[PDB]
Amino acid sequence: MIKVEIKPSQAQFTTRSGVSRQGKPYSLNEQLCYVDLGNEFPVLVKITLDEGQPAYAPGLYTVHLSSFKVGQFGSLMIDRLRLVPAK
Template identity: 45%
Template sequence: MIKIEIKPSQVDVTERSGEKNGKKWSSREQHGYIYNGGDYPALFLFRLQDGQPPYAAGFYELVESSIEVGEFKRLTFSRSFALRPIQNNKA
């Protein structure tokens, strides 16, 4: 299980937009901490889908479909990044 923590200060969403090659784009992002076996969890940024509310503060696990094999057989996060609350949220 890959554990993610969203702290109360991280429930805000960062929104960006722009234009590239004549096409408009927008991105919604939220911060969290990922527990990856180190001494401390690492701060990272993940995308939210259009219209998706931000994740509330608490502990989550990464949904399996959030990881895919990308170019050159490297693991990447999919565009449909999703988290599942950990039972009783006291991890």
């Protein structure tokens, strides 16, 4: 149950682009948020958006289960922080 917050100043993304090694392009959309990690203040995290996904609107989200996968050493890893609306 992680608490994630997109603040009103975080309502948009930025796009980073380029071209893969066997000549193919890519375009990454990045948005910022605040993840509450139990410290005094929420932490700033960058989240890479999915292909065809718009930026998350201001509000409170939690983390969707598809953000995780088993990594190549057999442990759990975060793949992409994918968010669902809270409560």
